[PDB]
Design an enzyme around this catalytic site. Structure first.
Site, PDB file in Angstrom:
ATOM      1  N   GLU A  78      -0.231  -0.460  -6.691  1.00 21.94           N
ATOM      2  CA  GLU A  78      -0.289  -0.650  -5.234  1.00 21.94           C
ATOM      3  C   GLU A  78      -1.749  -0.719  -4.743  1.00 21.94           C
ATOM      4  OE1 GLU A  78       0.950   2.870  -2.981  1.00 21.94           O
ATOM      5  OE2 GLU A  78       2.067   1.571  -1.531  1.00 21.94           O
ATOM      6  N   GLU A 172       0.682  -0.151   8.660  1.00 22.70           N
ATOM      7  CA  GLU A 172       1.278   1.007   8.002  1.00 22.70           C
ATOM      8  C   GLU A 172       0.958   2.188   8.884  1.00 22.70           C
ATOM      9  OE1 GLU A 172       0.099   1.632   3.970  1.00 22.70           O
ATOM     10  OE2 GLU A 172       1.357   3.354   3.708  1.00 22.70           O
TER      11      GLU A 172
END
EC number: 3.2.1.8
Length: 185
Positions: A78, A172
């Site tokens: 990620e 996010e």
């Protein structure tokens, strides 16, 4: 370029109102949330890709990131290119710096343990980060030259997987409230 992938995930906390707008446009209005990630991009990321975006609204109240966000598989990583943030600047193990697109970024690595993968199942995996040193201004057109970050990460022992998954310009948030409006091409 045309975007082809819509990223809309929430853990179910508070209210995350995400709109899949025209072409590359999206908006999020959120409040009292848990953790969520929303954006637009491509299902299959490239180490060669050049991303253009214009964040017409960047108004987190609390902890949110304005960020290139994506994954590889084989192995599982990620990765982030953080252009702006809210009350909290994310960091990890300092590796060095990269200059790209008018900004200086810090390079960091993290490990996540007992943690949801792209697929949601818990395991251990590494994250790679470039995080801008100060916040990028928002509201005009901005480029992220991803290959600059791929290259600099490689010089610091941070190799990406071979099988690319999605790659998006995202909002996010972590236990916060806010508004954003981003356009991706």
């Amino acid at each position: 370029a045309s975007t082809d992938y819509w990223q809309n995930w929430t853990d179910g906390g508070g209210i995350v109102n995400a709109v899949n707008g025209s072409g590359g446009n999206y908006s999020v209005n959120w409040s009292n949330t848990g953790h969520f990630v929303v954006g637009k991009g491509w299902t299959t990321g490239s180490p060669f890709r050049t991303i253009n975006y214009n964040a017409g609204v960047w108004a987190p109240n609390g902890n949110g990131y304005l960020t290139l966000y994506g994954w590889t598989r084989s192995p599982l990583i990620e990765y982030y290119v953080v252009d702006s943030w809210g009350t909290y600047r994310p960091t990890g193990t300092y590796k060095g710096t990269v200059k790209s697109d008018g900004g200086t970024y810090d390079i960091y690595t993290t490990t996540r343990y007992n943690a949801p993968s792209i697929d949601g199942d818990r395991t251990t995996f590494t994250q790679y980060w470039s995080v801008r040193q100060s916040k990028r201004p928002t509201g005009s057109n901005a480029t992220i030259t991803f290959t600059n970050h791929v290259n600099a990460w490689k010089s610091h022992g941070m190799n990406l997987g071979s099988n690319w998954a999605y790659q998006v310009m995202a909002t996010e948030g972590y236990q916060s409230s806010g508004s954003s409006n981003v356009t991706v091409w």
